[PDB]
Design an enzyme around this catalytic site. Sequence first.
Site, short mmCIF file in Angstrom:
data_model
loop_
_atom_site.label_atom_id
_atom_site.label_comp_id
_atom_site.label_asym_id
_atom_site.label_seq_id
_atom_site.Cartn_x
_atom_site.Cartn_y
_atom_site.Cartn_z
N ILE A 172 0.83 -1.20 0.00
CA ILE A 172 0.00 0.00 0.00
C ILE A 172 0.87 1.25 0.00
CG2 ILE A 172 -1.69 1.33 1.36
CD1 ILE A 172 -2.26 -1.35 2.91
N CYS A 173 0.68 2.13 -0.98
CA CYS A 173 1.35 3.44 -1.04
C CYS A 173 0.46 4.42 -0.30
CB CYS A 173 1.50 3.85 -2.52
SG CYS A 173 2.41 5.37 -2.67
N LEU A 174 0.86 4.81 0.92
CA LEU A 174 0.06 5.65 1.80
C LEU A 174 1.06 6.38 2.69
CD1 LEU A 174 -2.63 6.59 2.90
CD2 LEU A 174 -2.60 4.54 4.45
#
Length: 149
Positions: A86-88
Amino acid sequence: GAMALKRIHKELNDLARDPPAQCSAGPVGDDMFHWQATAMGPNDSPYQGGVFFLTIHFPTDYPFKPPKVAFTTRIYHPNINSNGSICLDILRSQWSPALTISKVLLSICSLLCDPNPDDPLVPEIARIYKTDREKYNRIAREWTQKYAM
């Protein structure tokens, strides 16, 4: 160490009393540093009706570094790849010890609702999110049916 364990127990107690979303989360068996989570696909999103599983690993210096969080259910989204990474920002550069696993899950649900296509983990999905939102929604619905029901 002990500070981390104390913080993790506090966050577990709070999550049971005030669940974020639609989500659940807690230890895998007796391991307080490895959790499972689930998130319901938000109503009025292309993920509606799906249930998405995640794995969470807390670092030994929690809460002063972020937990590692990944999806185990496949999902069509610009910021989540085929490995479930997840890119967060809050899971990287924007972590703060004031964040908690409940806040992380709220942020992940918001991300499902409203992607960041300018941080494309999956470039083509980011592209169609921008250029053809109806096609993005259609494929994301199809993948919800295929993987998340």
